[PDB]
């Protein structure tokens, strides 16, 4: 192609001075350069300088070819093919140029093209490399392989797709062969490639899944880190996939890995660590690592100390890597703690003694970390050493060096449960106090832990906080005008949580006086488009619930803002659909929060929302929200549907007609939360409808059972299922009673394990009416019903009696001597407890 020596003495200069030190000339020259991309003949200049102008010096040469790569990143859709096929040509040829630098540039352009212009569009490329992979010249081989890798990383499922007819078959053994090749670099290039296809559990490899396994071990003792790295990745990966192909040789490996954990190179150490996590999955662990235990645990802990450079990058959002080695170690240890429970302490506890009270802080910190890290797994066996260890940590919430006070917070919150169990004037009070101090700690980092650790504490210390409340808020609201970005979100959570935990006890005026102003402040200095509204509204929905009627001074504008945000978001949704290219895709977390914050007003205010509901097209709005494709929007609305039903049902009864079907559509346990909410809705709905639920019974009832008779179905959704069913039956007995037999099993199996509340109270009046109507449903499982009657500590007089009439009629019906036989089953904490309360 013709250089046109006018457009050559034009670029060369603008390349020469594209490097000149000063940023002034740097930017002018680089922009008035890539702007000359208007020529379709422009990208053809940017290869000639690289591949052909070998009288120009190397950096200048490389830079030109280099820019082209970027003129492929963008500016590819304006590609003349005459340019492109020529660019493709000079590269795939000059692939192993004599110079390291030049050889390098080319390889990247290849990886770019084979990604930007897909792979299929350059069909020749792959079987050419897979061939130029046998070339005698190192420079061509490593240069071909080097590209073949980075490409084999990007298009990992594209090549295994049909697009390239899967050229992996010819490449799996081909790549797997260079696994003994004399050059270290290439051995690495090889194992890197064959790694991509371990998790995507590829077929082309599943063939060589034995010469790969074996050809891997052959590199076990390689001194080159880069290789030993890859061996470990593949070695780790293989543990999820074809675990069977490792089961035999595994002991050799758990030793090899244990060593690898200490490897000279951090990366190898790190990657060999990732292994302990993945291993700690399959229940095989309990029966294998049992022995390695006292060897590995310390080798683990010894890595959980901060690195030296770690300390420096701390004591922007001044952070270390998101994935440390320390982090990996700690992670693993946590998991491990869970696997071996209290039967782990002896192998670790000793270290802690030698760690926790040590002189150098760096050792303390890590000990502290370990302490918390093992918390949940070794809890039972941790109680003995808590009573005096806690007061220690509470001292440690002072240790001069920031990172120490920092960690202590978290660690403490990990044993927050036990703390609430012990009287406050010894444990909780001290902790709470000191934490409140640390919330306003001068070190941003120490604020973070503290405030979160505090959030955690609140949840545990339900109403135990109530007395110390004026204090909490005092510090927590100053924290409000000192906290910047993410520290704020936590505060939001500390607040919501406070509200959540202390509930109506927050209604006293003096509290409202403190809390509201800073909130109502944010609220005002914010707009219907700023995504910083999420965490505030979210917080507010908890406040509103807690502040029952004390919130009246605010609802109007609040309620308003919310409908607005739905109105708009919902509007934007369909317009994004009916105008993809002019109507901006809306953020639905605006609609979500609104609804949430809404069912919080509905909850706290109850019958007082009547008006606000009545005077707005709010009903019709959720009507759309339940159908919205996004799971959360679905759930969030149902929740509100329940709460509105609970408040002013008279405003629902219209829309209920077409509402029930949508509920019945979302009754799908694949979406736990959605299914849950929807279910609960029907309870409150039905209890408000009466026989009027008649028509809808046959729709929903049948699903709820298959939900309640389903494996791994969470308890939350099991609870609500069983309750709703009772309610439906309570108002539609004739209709649900004739089904009794199915659910009467997991019903009691779910409802025996819950607190004696109204939700429970109605649920049992439900069974008790379905039994009056179909007594024949109970007899086969009258046992499970009794362990359900037992569950009641304080049952309302009439219903307690309702139970009593059942049991007594049952006895009257089967015989006293037959009663005997059956009685001799349930454990004494039942047998007598029923003969006590209701009497034989």
Curated annotation (Swiss-Prot):
Site (Important for interaction with cargo nuclear localization signals): 410, 680
Compartment(s) where it occurs, according to its Swiss-Prot or TrEMBL record: Cytoplasm; Nucleus
Xref: SUPFAM superfamilies: ARM repeat (SSF48371)
Keyword Transport tagged: yes
Keywords: Acetylation, Cytoplasm, Host-virus interaction, Nucleus, Protein transport, Repeat, Transport
Annotated ranges, domain Importin N-terminal: 29-97
Domain of life: Eukaryota
Cellular-component GO terms for this entry: cilium; cytoplasm; cytosol; extracellular exosome; nucleolus; nucleoplasm; nucleus
Gene Ontology MF: a single term: RNA binding
Family annotation (Pfam families): HEAT, HEAT_EZ, IBN_N
PROSITE patterns: IMPORTIN_B_NT
Primary location group: cytoplasm
GO biological process: protein import into nucleus
Known partners and oligomeric status: Identified in a complex that contains TNPO1, RAN and RANBP1. Binds HNRPA1, HNRPA2, HNRNPDL, RPS7, RPL5 and RAN. Interacts with H2A, H2B, H3 and H4 histones. Interacts with isoform 1 and isoform 5 of ADAR/ADAR1 (via DRBM 3 domain). Interacts with SNAI1 (via zinc fingers); the interaction mediates SNAI1 nuclear import. Interacts with SNAI2 (via zinc fingers). Interacts with RPL23A (via BIB domain) and SRP19; this interaction is involved in RPL23A and SRP19 import into the nucleus. (Microbial infection) Binds to HIV-1 Rev.
Function description: Functions in nuclear protein import as nuclear transport receptor. Serves as receptor for nuclear localization signals (NLS) in cargo substrates. May mediate docking of the importin/substrate complex to the nuclear pore complex (NPC) through binding to nucleoporin and the complex is subsequently translocated through the pore by an energy requiring, Ran-dependent mechanism. At the nucleoplasmic side of the NPC, Ran binds to the importin, the importin/substrate complex dissociates and importin is re-exported from the nucleus to the cytoplasm where GTP hydrolysis releases Ran.
Protein name in UniProt: Transportin-1
Native species: Homo sapiens (Human)
Upper taxonomic lineage: Eukaryota, Metazoa, Chordata, Craniata, Vertebrata
Gene name as annotated: TNPO1
